[PDB]
From Swiss-Prot, chains B, C:
Localisation: Secreted
Portion of the parent chain present: 27 to 147 of 152
GO molecular function terms attached to this record: biotin binding
Protein name: Avidin
The keyword Transcription regulation belongs to this UniProt entry's keyword annotation: no
Entry PTM: N-linked glycan at Asn-15 consists of GlcNAc(beta1-2)Man(alpha1-3)[GlcNAc(beta1-4)][Man(alpha1-?)Man(alpha1-6)] Man(beta1-4)GlcNAc(beta1-4)GlcNAc.
Gene: AVD
Glycosylation-annotated residues: N15
Tissue specificity note: Synthesized in hen oviduct and concentrated in egg white (where it represents 0.05% of the total protein).
A Gene Ontology cellular-component term: extracellular region
Amino acid sequence: RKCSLTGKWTNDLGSNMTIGAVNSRGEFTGTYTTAVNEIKESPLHGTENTINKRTQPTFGFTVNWKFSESTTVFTGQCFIDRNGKEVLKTMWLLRSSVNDIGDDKKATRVGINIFTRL
Amino acid sequence: KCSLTGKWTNDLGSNMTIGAVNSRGEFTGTYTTKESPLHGTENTINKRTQPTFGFTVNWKFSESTTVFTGQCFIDNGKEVLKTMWLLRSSVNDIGDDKKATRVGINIFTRL
Amino acid sequence: KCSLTGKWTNDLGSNMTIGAVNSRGEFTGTYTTKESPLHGTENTINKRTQPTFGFTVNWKFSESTTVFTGQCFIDNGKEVLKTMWLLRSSVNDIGDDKKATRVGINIFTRL
Amino acid sequence: RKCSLTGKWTNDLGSNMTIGAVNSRGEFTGTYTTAVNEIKESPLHGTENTINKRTQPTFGFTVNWKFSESTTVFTGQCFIDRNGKEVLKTMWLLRSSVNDIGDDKKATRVGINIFTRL
């Protein structure tokens, strides 16, 4: 079986990610819906690695937040978990905007996000 | 000044070319370490002169994926892209997921 | 409640034992994945009931070093250590430094 | 030649790190001096890996900031650089204190620090 990025995904926080069809070049776009009732959507786009047509490919995407000057990038692998469900194991970097090059040092946060099909 | 469009290099001599950034902030380019495509977006919320951006390099010579995020600055008057990245390796079993992600920095200057 | 002292485990079944935390916030312990020592400190500035802490595991079966940092929380009423870590591998040449560091998370619960 | 952690080190920002003697078990303590004129010192302690008595060992330490509720951990390798100087290539995680487990996700920052002998 293969894990496929296309579809709707959710995480522990109830965020909602929708990824479109992956084209011939491994490119895809989608939307990332998060709460802050108050919910907001931001576009995302990235690629799935296609090198040896693995059934569990690595991928990455950038979320261009519409409600902040920040940017978050996610990278991970689309796995068929031991329990048979597809799962996206990802890690992310959240970059904040700073005005002075001197404050660059503390502008990057890191964390994880695990998604399963909605 | 500090436009992503153009050619960039780093201490290792890699070559990153970024094309025009469209009205939505989207851009594509290539990364030569031998050449792989990259796609990303620059944030445009407050039309900043030094916005944050992120991109994904879809390596064509391995099953891995690397993502970069950072901001452009003017140090002299020299432009610099200060970025941090996550390199995701492909593992065969989900049990090895925990050691599949490397992290680091990459500072680019105009070639 | 939420004292670091005690025995902790995780989803992988590792076993982390932490001893008493001294007046300066210092502590030692062991990490069984097979047993390696760890040393760290918990911040005590505002005598928080859920202070931040960090520690270093000095692996005895490899040339690597892993550092952890996080905070204890009460989810039910169950205590949990939410930590993030950096695993540093030993490389022979400084040229390979850029790919020597892995990053991840580890959530611990009382054993 | 061997790279040795003991001594005084500085980075690009002029921060100042002093590391004491490394004992038989690879343990060491020291102080980390940073600016915010206005300078402050915080204690640090960690270990150097001794497994195959490498000339360029890995190590890690925790800085217990005295002026914040935060904690930073550093890990890296003590190298003899190509130019012959000893250099500490490190990466760090800076953990901020949050009150709600719900805000744990954005409490960790990541970055690098390169030190050379003062």
